[PDB]
PDB file of C-alpha atoms and ligand atoms in Angstrom:
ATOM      1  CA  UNK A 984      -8.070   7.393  -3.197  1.00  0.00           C
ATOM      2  CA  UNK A 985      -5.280   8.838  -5.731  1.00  0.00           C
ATOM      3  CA  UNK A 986      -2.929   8.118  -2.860  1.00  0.00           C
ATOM      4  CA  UNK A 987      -1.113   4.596  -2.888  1.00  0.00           C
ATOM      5  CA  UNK A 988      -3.096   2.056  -0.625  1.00  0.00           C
ATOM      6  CA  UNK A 989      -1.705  -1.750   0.958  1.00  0.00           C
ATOM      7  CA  UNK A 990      -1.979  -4.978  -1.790  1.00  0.00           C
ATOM      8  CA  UNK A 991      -0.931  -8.106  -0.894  1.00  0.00           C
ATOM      9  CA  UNK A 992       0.814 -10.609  -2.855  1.00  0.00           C
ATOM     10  CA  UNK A 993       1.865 -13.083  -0.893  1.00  0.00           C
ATOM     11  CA  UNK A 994       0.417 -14.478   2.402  1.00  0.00           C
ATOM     12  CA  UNK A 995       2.190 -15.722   4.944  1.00  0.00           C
ATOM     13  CA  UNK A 996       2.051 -19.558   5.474  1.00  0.00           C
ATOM     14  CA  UNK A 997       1.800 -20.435   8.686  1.00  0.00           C
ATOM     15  CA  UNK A 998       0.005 -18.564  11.582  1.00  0.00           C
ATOM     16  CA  UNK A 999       2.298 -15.568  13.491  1.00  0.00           C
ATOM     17  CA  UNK A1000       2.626 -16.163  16.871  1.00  0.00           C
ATOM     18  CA  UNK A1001      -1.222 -14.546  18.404  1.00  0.00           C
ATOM     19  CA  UNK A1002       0.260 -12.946  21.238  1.00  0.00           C
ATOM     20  CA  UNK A1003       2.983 -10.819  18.901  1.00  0.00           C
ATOM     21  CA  UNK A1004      -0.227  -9.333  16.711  1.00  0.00           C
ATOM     22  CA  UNK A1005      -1.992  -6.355  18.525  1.00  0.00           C
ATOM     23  CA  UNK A1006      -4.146  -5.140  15.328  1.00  0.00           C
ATOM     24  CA  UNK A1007      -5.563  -6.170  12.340  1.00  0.00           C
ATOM     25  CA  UNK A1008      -6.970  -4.250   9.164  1.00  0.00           C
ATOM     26  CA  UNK A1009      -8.541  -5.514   5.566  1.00  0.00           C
ATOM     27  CA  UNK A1010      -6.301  -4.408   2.552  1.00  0.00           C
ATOM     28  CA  UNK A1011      -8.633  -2.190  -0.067  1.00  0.00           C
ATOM     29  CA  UNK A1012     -11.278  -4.297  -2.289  1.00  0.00           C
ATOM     30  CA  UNK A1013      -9.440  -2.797  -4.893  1.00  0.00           C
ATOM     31  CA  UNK A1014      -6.784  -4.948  -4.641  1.00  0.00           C
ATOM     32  CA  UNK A1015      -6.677  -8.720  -6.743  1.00  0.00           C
ATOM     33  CA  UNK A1016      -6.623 -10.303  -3.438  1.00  0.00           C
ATOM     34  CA  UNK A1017      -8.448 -10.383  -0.397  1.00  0.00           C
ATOM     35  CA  UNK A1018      -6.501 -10.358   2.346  1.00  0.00           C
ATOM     36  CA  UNK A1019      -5.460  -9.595   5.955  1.00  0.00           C
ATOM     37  CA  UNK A1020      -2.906  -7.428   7.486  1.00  0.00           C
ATOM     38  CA  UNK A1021      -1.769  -7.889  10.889  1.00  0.00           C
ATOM     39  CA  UNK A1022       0.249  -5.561  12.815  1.00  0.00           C
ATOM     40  CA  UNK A1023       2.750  -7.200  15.067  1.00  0.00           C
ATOM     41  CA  UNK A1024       4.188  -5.524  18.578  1.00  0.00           C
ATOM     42  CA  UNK A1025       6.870  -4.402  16.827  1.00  0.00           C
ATOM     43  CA  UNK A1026       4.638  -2.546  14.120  1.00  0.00           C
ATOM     44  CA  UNK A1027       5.148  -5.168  11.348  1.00  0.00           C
ATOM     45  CA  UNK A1028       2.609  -5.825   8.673  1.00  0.00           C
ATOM     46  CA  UNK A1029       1.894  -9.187   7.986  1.00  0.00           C
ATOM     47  CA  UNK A1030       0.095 -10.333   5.191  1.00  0.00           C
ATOM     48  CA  UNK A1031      -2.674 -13.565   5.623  1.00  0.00           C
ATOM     49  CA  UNK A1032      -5.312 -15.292   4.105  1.00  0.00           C
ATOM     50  CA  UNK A1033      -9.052 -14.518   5.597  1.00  0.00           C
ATOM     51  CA  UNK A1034      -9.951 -17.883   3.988  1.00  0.00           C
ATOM     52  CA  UNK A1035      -7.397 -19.708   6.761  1.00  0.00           C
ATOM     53  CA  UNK A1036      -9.264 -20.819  10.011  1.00  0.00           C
ATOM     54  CA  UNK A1037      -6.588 -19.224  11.953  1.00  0.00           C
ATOM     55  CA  UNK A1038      -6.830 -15.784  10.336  1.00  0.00           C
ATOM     56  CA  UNK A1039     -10.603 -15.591  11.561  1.00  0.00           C
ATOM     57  CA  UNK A1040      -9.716 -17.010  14.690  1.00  0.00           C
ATOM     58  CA  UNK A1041      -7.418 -14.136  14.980  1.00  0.00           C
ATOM     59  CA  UNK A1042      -9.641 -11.553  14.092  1.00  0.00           C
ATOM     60  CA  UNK A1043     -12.538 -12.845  16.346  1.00  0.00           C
ATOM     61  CA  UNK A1044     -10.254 -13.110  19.230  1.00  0.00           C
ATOM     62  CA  UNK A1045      -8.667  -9.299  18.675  1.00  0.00           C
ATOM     63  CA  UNK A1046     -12.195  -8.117  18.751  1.00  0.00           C
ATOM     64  CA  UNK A1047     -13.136  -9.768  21.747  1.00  0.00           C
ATOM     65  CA  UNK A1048     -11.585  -6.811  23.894  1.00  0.00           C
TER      66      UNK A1048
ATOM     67  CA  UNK B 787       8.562  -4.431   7.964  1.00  0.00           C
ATOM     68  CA  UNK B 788       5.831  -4.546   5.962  1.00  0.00           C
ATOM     69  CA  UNK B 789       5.076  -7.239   3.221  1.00  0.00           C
ATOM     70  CA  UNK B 790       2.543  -5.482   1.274  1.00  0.00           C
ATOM     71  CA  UNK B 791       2.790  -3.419  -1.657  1.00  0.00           C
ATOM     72  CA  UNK B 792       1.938  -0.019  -2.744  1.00  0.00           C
ATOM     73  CA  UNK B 793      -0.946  -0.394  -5.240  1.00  0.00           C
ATOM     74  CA  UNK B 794      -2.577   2.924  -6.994  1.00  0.00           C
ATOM     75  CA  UNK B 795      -6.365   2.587  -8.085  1.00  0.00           C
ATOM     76  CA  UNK B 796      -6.924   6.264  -9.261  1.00  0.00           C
ATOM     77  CA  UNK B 797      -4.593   8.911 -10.522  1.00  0.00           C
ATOM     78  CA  UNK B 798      -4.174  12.882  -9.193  1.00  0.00           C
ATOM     79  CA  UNK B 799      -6.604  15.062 -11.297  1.00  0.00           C
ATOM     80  CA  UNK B 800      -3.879  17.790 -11.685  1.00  0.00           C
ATOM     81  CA  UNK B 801      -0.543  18.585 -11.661  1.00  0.00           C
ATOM     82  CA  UNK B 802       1.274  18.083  -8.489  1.00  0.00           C
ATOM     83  CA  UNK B 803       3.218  21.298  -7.244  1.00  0.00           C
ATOM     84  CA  UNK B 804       6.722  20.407  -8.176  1.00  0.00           C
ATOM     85  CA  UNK B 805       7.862  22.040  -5.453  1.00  0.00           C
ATOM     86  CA  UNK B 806       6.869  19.772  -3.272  1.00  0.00           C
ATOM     87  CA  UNK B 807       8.161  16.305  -4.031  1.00  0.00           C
ATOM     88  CA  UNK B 808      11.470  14.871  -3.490  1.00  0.00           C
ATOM     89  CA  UNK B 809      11.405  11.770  -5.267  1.00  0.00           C
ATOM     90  CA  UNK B 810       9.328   9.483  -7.261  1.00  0.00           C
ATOM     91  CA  UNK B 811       9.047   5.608  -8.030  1.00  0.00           C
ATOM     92  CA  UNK B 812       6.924   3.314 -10.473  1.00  0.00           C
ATOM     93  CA  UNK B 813       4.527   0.816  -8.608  1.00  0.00           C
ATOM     94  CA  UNK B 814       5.023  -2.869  -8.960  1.00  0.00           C
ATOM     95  CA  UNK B 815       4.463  -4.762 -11.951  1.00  0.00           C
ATOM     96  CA  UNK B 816       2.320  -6.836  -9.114  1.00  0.00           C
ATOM     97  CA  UNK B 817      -0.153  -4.164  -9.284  1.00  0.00           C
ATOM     98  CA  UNK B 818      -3.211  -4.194 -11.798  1.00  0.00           C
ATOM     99  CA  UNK B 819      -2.225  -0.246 -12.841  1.00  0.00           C
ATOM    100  CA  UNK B 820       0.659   1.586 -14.158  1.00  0.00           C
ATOM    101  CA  UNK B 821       1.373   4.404 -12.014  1.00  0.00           C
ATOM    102  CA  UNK B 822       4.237   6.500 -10.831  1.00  0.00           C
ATOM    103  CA  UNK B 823       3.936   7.812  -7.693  1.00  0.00           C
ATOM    104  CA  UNK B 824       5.491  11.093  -6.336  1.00  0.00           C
ATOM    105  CA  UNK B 825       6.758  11.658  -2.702  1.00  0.00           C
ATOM    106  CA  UNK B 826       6.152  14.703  -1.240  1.00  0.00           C
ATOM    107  CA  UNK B 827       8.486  16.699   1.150  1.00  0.00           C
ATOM    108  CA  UNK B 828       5.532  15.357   3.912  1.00  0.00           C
ATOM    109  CA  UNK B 829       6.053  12.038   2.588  1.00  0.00           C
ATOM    110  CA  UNK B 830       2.354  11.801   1.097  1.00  0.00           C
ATOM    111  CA  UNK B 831       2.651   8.903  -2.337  1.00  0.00           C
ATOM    112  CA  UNK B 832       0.332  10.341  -4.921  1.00  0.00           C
ATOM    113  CA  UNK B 833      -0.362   8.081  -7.731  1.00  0.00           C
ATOM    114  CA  UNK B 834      -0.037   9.619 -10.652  1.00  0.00           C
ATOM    115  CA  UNK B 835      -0.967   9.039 -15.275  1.00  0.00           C
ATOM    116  CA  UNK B 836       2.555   7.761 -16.223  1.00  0.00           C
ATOM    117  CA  UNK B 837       0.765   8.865 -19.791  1.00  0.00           C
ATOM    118  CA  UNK B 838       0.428  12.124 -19.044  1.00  0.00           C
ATOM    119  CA  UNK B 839       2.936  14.638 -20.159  1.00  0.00           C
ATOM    120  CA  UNK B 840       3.287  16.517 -16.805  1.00  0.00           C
ATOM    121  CA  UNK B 841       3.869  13.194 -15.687  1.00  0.00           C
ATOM    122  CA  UNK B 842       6.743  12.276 -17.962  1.00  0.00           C
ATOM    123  CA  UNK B 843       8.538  15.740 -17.583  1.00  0.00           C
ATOM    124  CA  UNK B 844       8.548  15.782 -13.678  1.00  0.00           C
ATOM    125  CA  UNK B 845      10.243  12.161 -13.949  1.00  0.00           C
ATOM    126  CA  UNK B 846      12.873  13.690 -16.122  1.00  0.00           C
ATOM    127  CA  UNK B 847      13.456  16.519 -14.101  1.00  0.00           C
ATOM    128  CA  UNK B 848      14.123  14.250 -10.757  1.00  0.00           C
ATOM    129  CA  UNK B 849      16.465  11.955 -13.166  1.00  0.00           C
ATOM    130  CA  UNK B 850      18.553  15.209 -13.531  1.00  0.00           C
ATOM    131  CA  UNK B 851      19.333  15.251  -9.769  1.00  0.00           C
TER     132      UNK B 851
HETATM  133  O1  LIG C1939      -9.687   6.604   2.621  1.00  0.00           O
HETATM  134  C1  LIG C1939      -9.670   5.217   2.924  1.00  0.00           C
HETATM  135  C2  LIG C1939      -9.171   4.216   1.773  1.00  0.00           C
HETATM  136  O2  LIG C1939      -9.402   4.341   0.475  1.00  0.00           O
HETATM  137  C3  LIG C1939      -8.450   3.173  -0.127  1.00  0.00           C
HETATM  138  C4  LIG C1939      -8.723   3.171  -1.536  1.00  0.00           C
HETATM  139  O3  LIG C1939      -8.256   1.975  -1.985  1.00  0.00           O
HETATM  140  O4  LIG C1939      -8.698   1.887   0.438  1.00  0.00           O
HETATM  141  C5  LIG C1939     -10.089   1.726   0.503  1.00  0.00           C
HETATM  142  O5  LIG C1939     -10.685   0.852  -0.542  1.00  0.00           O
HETATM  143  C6  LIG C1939     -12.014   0.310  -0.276  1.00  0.00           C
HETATM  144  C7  LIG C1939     -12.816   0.859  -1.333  1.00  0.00           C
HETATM  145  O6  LIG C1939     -12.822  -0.048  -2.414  1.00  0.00           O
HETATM  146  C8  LIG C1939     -12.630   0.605   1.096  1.00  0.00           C
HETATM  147  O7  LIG C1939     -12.824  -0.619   1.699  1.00  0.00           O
HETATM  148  C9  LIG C1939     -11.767   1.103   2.201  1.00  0.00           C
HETATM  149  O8  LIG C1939     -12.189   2.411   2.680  1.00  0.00           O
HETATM  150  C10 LIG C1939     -10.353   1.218   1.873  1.00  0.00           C
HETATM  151  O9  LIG C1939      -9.696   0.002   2.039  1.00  0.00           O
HETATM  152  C11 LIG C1939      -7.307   3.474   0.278  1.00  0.00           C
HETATM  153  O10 LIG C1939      -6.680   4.556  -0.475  1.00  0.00           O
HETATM  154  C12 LIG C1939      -7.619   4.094   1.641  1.00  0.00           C
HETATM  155  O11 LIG C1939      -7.287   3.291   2.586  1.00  0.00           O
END
């Protein structure tokens, strides 16, 4: 895209409450890292690690429905 | 909100229409590119060449207020 697109730079350290995160998307493989955003019930975008258990266990779980 | 960062991975072909952006900013030093990007009045954030001439004079003319 020649439009700006998400990077993350930091990841947050310890897992966000699950029941505050109703999405999830994967920044751009463009970007140094890998990562994933979460967006929280009050449209925040949180920045994690897809190498953290929790992080997958997120993303499994928002899938599931 | 949102802790990620505005990255640009490809530049805008051709001059923007002046006309239609109200501001501009440089992306972070974070980010693997230069770029400046320019804010439209519909709040798209086109990445633009901060090498490029066009570039360089549309950043002076916002400067001028
Ligand atoms: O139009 C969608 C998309 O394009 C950007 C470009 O970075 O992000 C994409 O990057 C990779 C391609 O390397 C794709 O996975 C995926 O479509 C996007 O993350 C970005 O402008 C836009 O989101």
């Amino acid at each position: 895209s020649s439009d700006t697109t998400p990077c993350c730079f930091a990841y947050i350290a310890r897992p966000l409450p699950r029941a505050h995160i109703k999405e999830y998307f994967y920044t751009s493989g463009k970007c140094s890292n890998p990562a994933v955003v979460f967006v929280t019930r009050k449209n925040r975008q949180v920045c994690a690690n897809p190498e953290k258990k929790w992080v997958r266990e997120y993303i499994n779980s928002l899938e599931m429905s």
